[PDB]
Amino acid sequence: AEPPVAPGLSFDFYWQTCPRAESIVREFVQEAVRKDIGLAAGLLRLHFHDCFVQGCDASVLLDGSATGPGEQQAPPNLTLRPSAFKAVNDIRDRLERECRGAVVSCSDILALAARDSVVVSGGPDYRVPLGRRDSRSFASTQDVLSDLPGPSSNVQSLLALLGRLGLDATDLVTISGGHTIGLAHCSSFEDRLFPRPDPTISPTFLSRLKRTCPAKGTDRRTVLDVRTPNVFDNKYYIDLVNREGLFVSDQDLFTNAITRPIVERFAQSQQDFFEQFGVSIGKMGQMRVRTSDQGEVRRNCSVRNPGPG
Amino acid sequence: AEPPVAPGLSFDFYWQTCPRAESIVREFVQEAVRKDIGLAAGLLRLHFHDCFVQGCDASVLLDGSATGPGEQQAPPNLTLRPSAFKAVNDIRDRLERECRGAVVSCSDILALAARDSVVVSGGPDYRVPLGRRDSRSFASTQDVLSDLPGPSSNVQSLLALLGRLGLDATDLVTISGGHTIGLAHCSSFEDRLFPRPDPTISPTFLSRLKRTCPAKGTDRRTVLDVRTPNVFDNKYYIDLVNREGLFVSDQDLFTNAITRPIVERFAQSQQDFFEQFGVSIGKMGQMRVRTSDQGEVRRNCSVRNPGPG
Numbered sequence: 001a002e003p004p005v006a007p008g009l010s011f012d013f014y015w016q017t018c019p020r021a022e023s024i025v026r027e028f029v030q031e032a033v034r035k036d037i038g039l040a041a042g043l044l045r046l047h048f049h050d051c052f053v054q055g056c057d058a059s060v061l062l063d064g065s066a067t068g069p070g071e072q073q074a075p076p077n078l079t080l081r082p083s084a085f086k087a088v089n090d091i092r093d094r095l096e097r098e099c100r101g102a103v104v105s106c107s108d109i110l111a112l113a114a115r116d117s118v119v120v121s122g123g124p125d126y127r128v129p130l131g132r133r134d135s136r137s138f139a140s141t142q143d144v145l146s147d148l149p150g151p152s153s154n155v156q157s158l159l160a161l162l163g164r165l166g167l168d169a170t171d172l173v174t175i176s177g178g179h180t181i182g183l184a185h186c187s188s189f190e191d192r193l194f195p196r197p198d199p200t201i202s203p204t205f206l207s208r209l210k211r212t213c214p215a216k217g218t219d220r221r222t223v224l225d226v227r228t229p230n231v232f233d234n235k236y237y238i239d240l241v242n243r244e245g246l247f248v249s250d251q252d253l254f255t256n257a258i259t260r261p262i263v264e265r266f267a268q269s270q271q272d273f274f275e276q277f278g279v280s281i282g283k284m285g286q287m288r289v290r291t292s293d294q295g296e297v298r299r300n301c302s303v304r305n306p307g308p309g
Numbered sequence: 310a311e312p313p314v315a316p317g318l319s320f321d322f323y324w325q326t327c328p329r330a331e332s333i334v335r336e337f338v339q340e341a342v343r344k345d346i347g348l349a350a351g352l353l354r355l356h357f358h359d360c361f362v363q364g365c366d367a368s369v370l371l372d373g374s375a376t377g378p379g380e381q382q383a384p385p386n387l388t389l390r391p392s393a394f395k396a397v398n399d400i401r402d403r404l405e406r407e408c409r410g411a412v413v414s415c416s417d418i419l420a421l422a423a424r425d426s427v428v429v430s431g432g433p434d435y436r437v438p439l440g441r442r443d444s445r446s447f448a449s450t451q452d453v454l455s456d457l458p459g460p461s462s463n464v465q466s467l468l469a470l471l472g473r474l475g476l477d478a479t480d481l482v483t484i485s486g487g488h489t490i491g492l493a494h495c496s497s498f499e500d501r502l503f504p505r506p507d508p509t510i511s512p513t514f515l516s517r518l519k520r521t522c523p524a525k526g527t528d529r530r531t532v533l534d535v536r537t538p539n540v541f542d543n544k545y546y547i548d549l550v551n552r553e554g555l556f557v558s559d560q561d562l563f564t565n566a567i568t569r570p571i572v573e574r575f576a577q578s579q580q581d582f583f584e585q586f587g588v589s590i591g592k593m594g595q596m597r598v599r600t601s602d603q604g605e606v607r608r609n610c611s612v613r614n615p616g617p618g
């Protein structure tokens with residue numbers, strides 16, 4: 001289906017101003033991901049990360065923002081892929097060239113690139129509402145701490161957070177499917193291994209995880225989806241059913257009575273998952289967006305447009 | 310004379326790496342100032358401003374820093390010239406091209422551009438110690454408030470602040486000579502007019518100032534040096550002797566017994582002023598600098614070099 005459109009946004013927002021905008025972003029992503037498969041996961045996560053930190057307003061792309069491109073102090077689980085930040089900037093440049101001006105916002109680029117990353121990885125092609133404006137407000141560590149969901153959080157905590165932000169249980173289970181591709185550093189799940197193992201981890205999976213992260217503090221990464229690491233599909237839900245979810249936030253989806261039925265549904269039908277994904281990710285991608293007068297269209301995603309006004 | 314060199318810095322720091330660096334900066338400034346005379350004042354003040362806020366480390370050039378290029382909330386007296394930020398970036402780009410790589414730091418560019426701005430405005434040609442590194446730390450409003458001297462401050466307060474930062478009374482009187490060029494917004498001196506006029510302002514000058522700023526809150530600017538607004542010379546000291554200094558920080562230099570003799574000396578001999586300027590501005594330009602491992606060489610002055618390390 002198609003996601004509900006928030007006030008101010010619309011599909012084909014650039015139809016008149018820059019009709020080929022979406023094609024340019026896709027063509028760039030296709031080539032970029034071909035050269036670096038992990039870029040797809042990076043871009044997809046970047047969109048998610050940004051959306052939760054203050055809203056889908058490209059705030060985390062700013063150098064002045066916590067977890068932004070110049071961040072070197074944050075732990076592995078809070079540091080985004082450098083190539084993801086770079087890709088967005090490159091796309092922005094290419095778009096300015098194509099549109100004969102800075103018409104497309106970095107916020108929209110994030111939404112489009114994420115969609116294309118999914119498509120390029122074998123996922124569903126869904127429509128993306130456009131018209132978001134870029135924020136001139138930097139994200140503080142406080143913003144990150146209060147709005148960004150952590151991997152150690154259970155479904156109860158996540159439903160509360162997402163509830164405040166306008167997403168329901170279905171959205172939670174659905175957007176969590178983003179973990180069907182990508183990597184995770186030991187630090188993000190080592191607490192499920194030490195001191196004592198999480199009883200929800202299947203014995204076989206535990207042995208595997210202990211090999212990857214022999215002790216707390218191990219500097220190593222592993223795949224989020226043990227079955228198909230780089231293919232966007234429903235295998236992530238099958239992992240959960242088999243007690244092979246990496247994070248507590250992953251596995252608890254199968255443990256919790258409220259989310260369990262949805263997990264089982266998606267595990268049984270990839271089509272059910274794909275159809276719902278475009279809707280739920282569409283809703284996530286419209287959280288607290290800046291419209292028209294609320295933001296600007298950056299000439300460089302890393303910085304706010306210079307000038308007194 | 311030549312200013313004392315701080316540990317880590319040296320004249321001709323780029324002699325081997327990029328010998329023509331200094332020539333490129335001058336040539337750019339000469340042309341840029343020709344097109345926009347006010348740019349000289351902008352660059353000169355930018356160097357001063359940056360040096361006091363945390364140290365001569367180009368921190369204020371960062372978009373993430375208070376009073377930086379993206380600042381739109383600060384009052385007129387705390388907003389630097391947009392063209393000054395732009396010029397520095399342009400110089401940095403030209404230098405990367407010339408040096409065949411990002412060799413020269415933005416911090417050094419600030420020091421050189423300031424020197425060239427003085428020279429182009431008819432001032433003395435002095436040697437500049439080089440080798441400063443760019444900071445990865447953003448300046449907070451707190452940093453600005455505690456280290457940046459305000460126009461309402463008297464000599465007693467200024468000597469205390471500068472004393473902590475390694476500058477003496479001579480340095481104060483000398484670097485204050487920077488006000489021999491440039492502009493100031495009514496907000497920076499309106500407190501000397503309303504509610505009751507500052508008795509140190511000569512009657513004639515007061516009438517003039519009241520015309521420029523009829524009431525508190527007037528959005529208008531005036532020249533810092535009523536005699537030669539755009540020429541770098543000792544006329545600023547002559548203004549002080551005639552009770553025609555714009556700021557309290559200006560006029561009090563003549564009022565205070567400690568600084569008065571130096572003001573009178575410079576008013577009588579421009580040569581005495583010019584010779585001392587290169588030394589004092591040299592000292593100011595080396596306050597709390599980052600050397601070798603302490604910073605980086607930005608590929609873009611507005612942002613910290615992206616990456617985990």
Ligand code: HEM
Binds near residue numbers: 076078149150224
């Ligand atoms: C709301 C629950 C979520 C939590 C708690 C969460 C947490 C995390 C964490 C901690 C990492 C691993 C970082 C590391 O150790 O390197 C990660 C990676 C990832 N997440 Fe999520 N995530 C969630 C939702 C999402 C959503 C909505 C998407 C987007 C559809 C998404 C896409 C990804 C991707 C693709 C990666 C891999 C990134 C890469 O390989 O660079 N996540 N997530």
Ligand code: HEM
Binds near residue numbers: 460486488490494590
């Ligand atoms: C330490 C005492 C100083 C104080 C309190 C001070 C204060 C200020 C203030 C408030 C302005 C006016 C801003 C406005 O209203 O638009 C200004 C402008 C200026 N200052 Fe200073 N200043 C000082 C030292 C310096 C130094 C060391 C230099 C450099 C040699 C300098 C160079 C300038 C220049 C050229 C301008 C004009 C800038 C322009 O036209 O854009 N100042 N200063």
Ligand SMILES: [Ca+2]
Binds near residue numbers: 181
């Ligand atoms: Ca997969």
Ligand SMILES: [Ca+2]
Binds near residue numbers: 536537542545
């Ligand atoms: Ca003058």
Ligand code: NA
Binds near residue numbers: 049054
């Ligand atoms: Na954001």
Ligand code: NA
Binds near residue numbers: 361365366
């Ligand atoms: Na500074």
